[PDB]
Every structure is written in structure tokens, then in C-alpha cells.
Design a protein around this ligand. Structure first.
Ligand code: NA
Ligand code: NA
Ligand code: NA
Ligand code: NA
Ligand code: NA
Ligand code: NA
Lengths: 344, 344
């Protein structure tokens, strides 16, 4: 069962306004979640709308932040004022590209934000402006450090993007084996998960998403190191919450999260040159596509390539949603007087 | 059998001078390789000296580069002129910290360099100057892309570092399951390797380092995406060799490599603040050390922590080297009239 993305986008925005979010915030969230679904990244799509709205309802999210920005040369600090992550992140994107246009590069350290959805969306937006982009965000601890048995770091994802003649190369990855959102998606779809993703409360691997207590770092020490890099850039460096100091969106309803983000935009025009960069990216892209596939693969794909293909398809045939997610969205619609669209 | 690091360092430098390297280049290489050995990273230690010298002998390395540097605000491009990687990289480090001191951040794109050893060494040096550091380098293809069966990308490692009250957090990781240097080390030590690291020429996993044809990306798609990020920053963006365009240090003796590197230094003083940054890093460090260990672990360690401990120990008790490496170094010493030190 597929749904009209444009209708769901309008619906989500309306529900958010009804819940109290101002116009730019409601649009930013509707955009971030639906865009994720379009690309086939359900872990960061409308599946998240219910908890996002509940956080607002509980008074843990700023519905209309001013978003103070302080510039210092090619560096800028953004105060999210506890606004919705997508709203905060989109302003960070604008600030980063503006700084890069003027100085050749721009770094934005964000504090007091909240879960911002798919990191790749922001990196992609920056790349569409002609910049090489690097975007990171920390999160409440859900992952054991390498060699440890208790949660110490968030899934702390990182995203990177760069323009190419063939399209936008976009990488989006949690530094743990898997993002927690994928565990949530499995729960909604009623599916088992790879047992290497996490362990139960007794430290044993489990393929039951409902029994996952903590996640494991990607490839042991390496994913652990990457999680720390993301933590330093997104949290320590910005003035935002750091690891255990970050409020848990799903478990702590006493105060705002204070999630931090880090965004860096680089102008290739200041390096090898804009035209040269694109031609070189094109040759790299071409080379990867020309690589003979491994068994079980029809061809090699660039990060973001399949996502772009899925988006086009979903915009034409509609986007899919798990029955359980729809049921929750319907209940949410009734709670806020913005009924699920029967024409969607 | 352990050896005096100071004696080996002096020996290597002398052999390099004898082979034709100028003073700064010989010192840079001796430094990079021995420092790697001290930290227990033999994959990037003196094990590499023989091939480095052979590259110089064959006329594929500039023994005394001028190292032209072009600054453009917080960005700078460095022409390695085919000099030894460590020599080129050390100048990049100096340029990066200088730019960061003036602008708050500094990015250096390096082209026409060669294998530079352990990336973590450069990130660490930058962090000791008070900066958050990010260092990457591309390399000739040795890794299959996710979904592919032929080599398309180098092990393309990335390193990150940041100062803390307890020490310097330093992450150093190849984006493939393992670095090729670890495969070489296993060969010298006469040990088997994890079969998940690479495949033989027929595409089958092998635990025999002598039969490894291609390596696999870290955790499939994620390591592949990370390798591309490193390739874009180190190669595409800099004007250096890109993937298949990079000369193979071990297999192609017709022309220089043209390896590229990317270095970024961030001044925390321009973000949350220098003092605040250190205190926050200290709390994060403390939290990780306080995490209960998993079975088989005595405690949780920070990236770079064990490496620092090993360095101190090696400086006091001497550094170890595989018998096969020593034998090759001895043959090298005789070839260049700089005999292996019997007092080492
Ligand atoms: Na209420
Ligand atoms: Na009310
Ligand atoms: Na992804
Ligand atoms: Na010769
Ligand atoms: Na000669
Ligand atoms: Na390492």
C-alpha cells in the first residue's frame, strides 16, 4: 500500500501546526521525514512523527526558535534553542554555504538542537549548492564502546556529499553497526534483525528488535573511533550535550535533549577548481559504475544512487509505509484533529 | 628481540641520506616509521623502509622537494613534488596549524605526494598544538567497492585527533576491514590473517596473507562510503592522483605515485572555547574509562591510549621487529654501505 507523498507532506505539516509548531518548523520537519521515506530510509521518516509531536506536546521542544547565529570568520555557532532538529539543521545548512561562499569553507557548530532526522539530507542540500559537505550529529547513548558492556555513545551518524555530473554522491551512516531507527522500523514491520547489530539486556546477541538493549560499534574499534570523532565535533566542540549528557528522546521527558550537530562546507573552487572538480568526480563515478559486480549484485552503485532512484519512483508511484506506522499516524491525526487523509 | 629505537632512527636516517634523500626528508621518514613501530603499528613502521628506499633508488621519489605552498584564506594547496610522504605531510601539518591559528580553521589539500605512513601521527601532531585534527590520504586501489568484484579504491585511511587533559585522543583507521600493511606484517611474521579481511584472485576468502588479492570494505557499504569520502577529499579535491590513477608503490616502477592527502585543523577556541573544550574532552574521556568492560577486556581504552602506552614502554625497553624485517633491513644496510648497528 503506497501513499501520495505530497498529501502526506501537507498532512504532517498541518498536524505539526495544530500541535503548536510555527510555519518554518512544521515545514522543515514534514520535509525531513517525507524526504527520508521517499529515499527508502524509513528509519528516519514519518515513523518518527509521533514521538516528535509528543516531545512538542510534553513541552520539550521550542515550537518557534529565533535561532541565534554568531559568526567568527569561516566559523559560526548556532543556538538551536531546543527547536525541532530539521528546523535547526536547515538554518545551519544556509549558514554553512554562506560562509563557504565568502571564505572558501564554512564550519557551523550547533548546540541545543534535537533529533534532526536523516543526516544525508543536509549534506545533499549543501552539495546541490556546489559544495563538498560533511555533516555529523551526536545522540543519546545507545551503543557500547569497543571493549565495554554498557552504553556510552550514541549511534552518532556522519554524512558526506559532493556534486558529480551523474548526480549527487551522498553517504549517510550511523557509526554503530546499525542505526536505532532501523531497529524501530523492524519492530513496526514485524521483522527480525541481524543478530550482530546489538545485544539484549544480558549482553547476548538477539535478532528480536523488541529485545535489543544496546547496539554495537561498526567493526569493533573502528566504529567506536568514528563515534568519538562525531561526538567531539558535534558535542564537545559545540557546547551542546555530550554523550550521557544528551537527553533521551524516547526515555526522558523531564527536559530538552540538547543534541549537537557539526556541518562543514568546502568550496572546490578554492581547491582544484569548480570545473575540474566536477570532471574528476565524473571520472571517479564512471570508474565505480564500470566495476564488475560481485555475485548477487547486478552492478556497483554510488552512495546515494539507489536512494535517488527510489525517490523518483516514490514520487511517481507513491511511498510505502508499514501498517503499524499508519495506524499510529492515524491515532495521532485523531488526537490533534487533523484526520488521516482518505485521499492520500 | 627488542631494539633501541633511537639507534634505529639514526640508522634509518643515515641510510636514507646515503640513498640520496636530503636532510629534512631523511629525518621525516625515519621519524614516521620508527614512531609507528613505537606505538605498536608495525604495519607502517620500518617494515616499509626497504620499499621506500627502492622507490628512491628507482628514481620515483623527489629526494629534495621545494614543496610549493599556495594560500587562499583558510585554505592552502601543497605541491609535494613527488617527495617522500612523511616529508610532504609534515609541511602540510605546519601549514594547517598556521592557517588555523589565523583563521580559526585551516584546510590543506596535498597533491603529488607518496605513501606517508601512519595518518594518525599527523593528526596527533596537530592535536598537540591544541587543534582538533582530521587527516586523510588516498592510495592505489586494493579494495573492492561494495557490490563489486574488482579493486576500485585504496585502503584510504582517515585519522582524527583532539587534545584532552588525560592525553591525546587519536583515531587511525583504514576504511577497508584492514590496511594492506597489516597483511604485509602478517607475511613477515609468518601468521595467518582473519579471512574476512580479503579474498584471493578467485574471489574466495583466505586466511593466507600471501594469497590475498583484494581487500574488502569495512562493514560492506559503510566502509565503501568512507573510502569514497577519503578519495574525494584526498584525491578529487586536491588535484592529486585519483583511485586507479594513483601509481602502485609495490607494482608500478615507471612513474611516481601522485598520492593525495587532506588535512583540516580546527581551533576549539573559535567554538566552545579552549578551556571549556579541554574540560569537556576530559569528562568524555573519564566517562569512557568508567564504562564496565565486556568479557575479555580489563577496561575500556580511548583511541590512541594503548598506542601511547606502547610508545612509552618501547622507549624504555626497546622496540620489537619481526626477524624477516630485520633480515631485509640488514640486506638494505649492506646494499647502501650503512651496516645494521650491532649496538642497536
Ligand atoms: Na499535554
Ligand atoms: Na493542551
Ligand atoms: Na546510508
Ligand atoms: Na639504481
Ligand atoms: Na647508483
Ligand atoms: Na588504529
Amino acid at each position: 500500500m503506497r501513499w501520495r507523498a505530497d498529501f502526506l507532506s501537507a498532512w504532517a505539516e498541518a498536524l505539526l501546526r495544530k500541535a503548536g509548531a510555527d510555519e518554518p518548523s512544521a515545514k522543515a520537519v514534514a520535509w525531513a521525514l517525507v524526504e527520508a521515506d521517499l529515499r527508502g530510509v524509513g528509519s528516519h521518516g514519518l515513523l518518527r512523527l509521533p514521538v516528535y509531536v509528543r516531545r512538542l506536546e510534553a513541552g520539550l521542544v521550542n515550537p518557534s526558535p529565533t535561532l541565534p547565529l554568531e559568526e567568527r570568520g569561516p566559523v559560526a555557532l548556532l543556538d538551536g534553542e531546543h527547536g525541532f532538529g530539521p528546523r535547526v539543521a536547515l538554518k545551519a545548512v544556509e549558514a554553512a554555504q554562506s560562509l563557504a561562499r565568502r571564505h572558501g569553507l564554512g564550519a557551523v557548530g550547533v548546540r541545543r538542537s534535537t533529533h534532526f532526522g536523516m543526516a544525508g539530507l543536509y549534506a545533499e542540500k549543501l552539495a546541490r549548492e556546489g559544495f563538498v559537505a560533511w555533516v555529523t550529529t551526536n545522540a543519546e547513548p545507545d551503543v557500547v564502546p569497543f571493549g565495554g558492556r554498557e552504553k556510552a555513545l550514541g549511534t552518532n551518524p556522519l554524512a558526506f556529499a559532493a556534486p558529480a555530473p551523474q548526480g549527487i554522491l551522498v553517504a549517510d551512516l550511523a557509526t554503530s553497526e546499525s542505526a536505532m531507527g532501523k531497529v524501530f522500523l523492524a519492530r513496526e514491520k514485524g521483522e527480525r534483525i541481524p543478530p550482530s547489530w546489538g545485544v539484549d539486556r544480558e549482553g547476548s546477541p538477539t535478532d528480536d528488535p523488541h529485545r535489543v538493549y544496546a547496539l554495537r560499534p561498526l567493526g569493533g574499534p573502528k566504529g567506536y573511533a568514528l563515534a568519538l570523532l562525531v561526538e567531539v565535533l558535534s558535542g564537545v566542540l559545540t557546547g551542546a550535550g555530550v554523550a550521557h549528557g544528551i537527553g533521551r528522546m524516547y526515555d526522558e521527558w523531564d527536559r530538552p535533549q540538547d543534541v549537537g550537530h557539526f556541518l562543514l562546507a568546502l568550496d572546490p573552487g578554492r581547491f582544484v577548481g569548480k570545473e575540474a572538480f566536477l570532471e574528476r568526480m565524473g571520472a571517479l563515478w564512471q570508474a565505480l559504475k564500470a566495476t564488475p559486480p560481485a555475485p548477487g549484485h547486478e552492478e556497483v552503485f554510488l552512495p546515494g544512487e539507489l536512494e535517488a532512484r527510489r525517490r523518483e519512483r516514490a514520487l511517481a508511484e507513491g511511498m510505502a509505509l508499514p501498517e503499524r506506522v499508519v495506524a499510529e499516524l492515524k491515532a495521532l491525526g485523531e488526537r490533534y484533529g487533523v484526520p488521516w487523509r482518505d485521499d492520500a
